[PDB]
Amino acid sequence: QLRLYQLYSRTSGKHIQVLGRRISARGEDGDKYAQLLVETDTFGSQVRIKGKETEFYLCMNRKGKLVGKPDGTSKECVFIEKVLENNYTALMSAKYSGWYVGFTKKGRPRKGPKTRENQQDVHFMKRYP
């Protein structure tokens, strides 16, 4: 299943942007770089996230850095989607368990190794523009 939406960062107050190679969470509602095509496998656990504008996939490299890439074949470009008890959604790397997609209050992306599930930095709400 394919779906289109935006991811609102609990800490940054803005939406995730796939600007190209660079990833950020400073998108106003409706920002063209914040429109995300999200692919969900038949199990419902794993997702690929693609910026609709740039066509770059959101991925996490070995250094734990979030980065956009044109090629989304890598397992670094897959995330496990968890709806938490607090009703936010988190995105854990499928390649690097225990590492999460996250951002600072200024929308700067965080390093996987330095994250964990209970951090607000890694919490998101889904949004249908």
Author numbering: 51 to 179
From the reporting publication:
Fibroblast growth factors (FGFs) regulate a plethora of critical processes in development. These processes are mediated by signaling through four FGF receptors (FGFR1–4), which are high-affinity cell surface receptor tyrosine kinases. FGF18 belongs to the paracrine-acting FGF8 subfamily, which contains three members in humans: FGF8, FGF17, and FGF18. FGF18 has a number of functions in the developing and adult organism including a key role in skeletal development and has undergone clinical trials for the treatment of osteoarthritis (Merck KGaA).
